[PDB]
């Protein structure tokens, strides 16, 4: 009989388990025997307090480095305002030690945990690449609770070295199975930011994780977009509980918050899942997340059923992670087929946007060719366009099965006249659909202003396979 942790703050970890069903179903995974043993997670952040009484027992120097100061020791820099507490808080969510009379427990409280000190300084492309590419045959899972500015006017993503690190990680990392990159989808909710304007979350190589409050609502800081894959609990209003974790100076906190707290919980659940089947590829893991995540009782006004019967929201992706269901489905999972890529250049001539532009195109999805896709995974609309005020644009993409993805919602603060330069807007919402047939791109001016511009390129990029479907939900 599984005995749940006795740690003093475990009863306050409302998101891990409970009779109420408002949790991530993590105790059910623990009871199946999965606690993270043998899995290695690295927190890419401002450092990790490696001697913290709730981290020391799980700490892994092989999962750690200090990129800011070019040394192996990721110890945080101590300051009066405890500025560098952030990475230690994230690490405790993943792998805080259980049953040791200290604070609470990690989701994967027997996993090995490290940290890359890379935020305490100028975060260049090279700094990101050296962190994302750290010891990729030892680290299984990378957790990143940082990214481009959430001011609601930035469009930015990995530069060349960082993108090269993503492709090297998913291709050769973890023995060729692929590094698992977990990303926090963003804190830009108050600025009406879109997490599709963030190339890290929008990447197909990352599992972008959004947040839900204790009462099942969309937090004030949440960013909606089509690239988000799933959700974990985090903070909300001041009547809702928050996240319990290790804090700087060997302390315990019950007030960890924001998008930053969601990705580490996902990384922990993925660690449990990898223990249940160490042969899962980076794409396997995203399939498991899609199939097992739970919409129920998450409140949103945009829940839609896609072409294969799955509910999906721009606030939540496929819903809340379910650790028990993840580890159960992992055990007998059949590795997916190799990833195919079908490139469809849509336009025959540039198109003026004006007040509204609709581009319709019927595709065969590389019928007759070795990259024929009948089972979609990610889809991208790679758009090049000019426009006088970028944030007045709203962009939607409709799949042949009728699933409408919001690629871009209005961003009131985005006054940019720089448009989009082959920006690869990504949607997870048509996962497992057949992409053959009519795709529709809609670009509209959401303001009364007389805006102007031109769409000069629209590449539809389909990823997926031609085998192995399930009966739709």
């Amino acid at each position: 009989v599984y005995q749940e942790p006795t740690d003093p703050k475990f009863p306050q970890q409302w998101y891990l388990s409970g009779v109420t069903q408002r949790d991530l179903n993590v105790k059910a995974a623990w009871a199946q025997g999965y606690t993270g043993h043998g899995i290695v997670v690295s927190i890419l952040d401002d450092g990790i307090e490696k001697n913290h009484p709730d981290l020391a027992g799980n700490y892994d120097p092989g999962a750690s480095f200090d990129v800011n100061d070019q040394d192996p020791d990721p110890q945080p820099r101590y300051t009066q305002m405890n500025d560098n507490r952030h990475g230690t808080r994230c690490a405790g969510e993943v792998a805080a030690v259980a049953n040791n009379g200290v604070c609470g427990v990690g989701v994967a409280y027997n996993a090995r945990i490290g940290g890359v000190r890379m935020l305490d300084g100028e975060v260049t492309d090279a700094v990101e690449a050296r962190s994302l590419g750290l010891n990729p045959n030892h680290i299984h899972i990378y957790s990143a609770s940082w990214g481009p500015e959430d001011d609601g006017k930035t469009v930015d993503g990995p530069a060349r070295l960082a993108e090269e690190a993503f492709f090297r990680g998913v291709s050769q990392g973890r023995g060729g199975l692929g590094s698992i990159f977990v990303w926090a989808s963003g804190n830009g909710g108050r600025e009406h930011d879109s997490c599709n304007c963030d190339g890290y979350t929008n990447s197909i190589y990352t599992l972008s994780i959004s947040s839900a409050t204790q009462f099942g609502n969309v937090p004030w800081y949440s960013e909606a977009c089509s690239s988000t894959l799933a959700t974990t609990y985090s903070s909300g209003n001041q009547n809702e509980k928050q996240i319990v974790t290790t804090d700087l100076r060997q302390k315990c906190t019950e007030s960890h918050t924001g998008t930053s707290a969601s990705a580490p919980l996902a990384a922990g659940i993925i660690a449990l899942t990898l223990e249940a089947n160490k042969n899962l590829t980076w794409r396997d893991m995203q399939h498991l997340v899609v199939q097992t995540s739970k919409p129920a009782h998450l409140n949103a006004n945009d829940w839609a059923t896609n072409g294969v019967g799955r509910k999906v929201s721009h606030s939540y992706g496929y819903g809340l992670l379910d650790a028990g269901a993840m580890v159960a489905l992992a055990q007998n999972w059949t590795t997916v087929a190799p990833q195919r890529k079908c490139i469809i250049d849509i336009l025959t001539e540039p198109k003026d946007i004006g007040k509204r532009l609709e581009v319709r195109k019927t595709v065969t999805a590389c019928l007759g060719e070795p990259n024929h896709i009948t089972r979609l995974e990610h889809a991208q609309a790679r758009l090049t366009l000019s426009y006088n005020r970028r944030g007045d644009l709203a962009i939607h993409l409709v799949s042949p099965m009728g699933t409408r993805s919001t690629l871009l919602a209005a961003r009131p603060h985005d006054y940019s006249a720089d448009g989009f330069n082959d920006w690869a807007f990504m949607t997870t919402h048509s996962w497992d659909e057949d992409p053959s047939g009519e795709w529709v791109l809609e670009i509209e001016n959401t303001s009364e202003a007389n805006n102007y511009g031109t769409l000069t390129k629209f590449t539809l990029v389909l990823y997926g396979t031609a085998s192995g479907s399930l009966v739709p939900r």
């Binding site: 975060v123 609770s145 990214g147």
Partner: peptide
């Protein structure tokens, strides 16, 4: 900043 917590 180029990147933020």
């Amino acid at each position: 900043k180029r990147r933020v917590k």
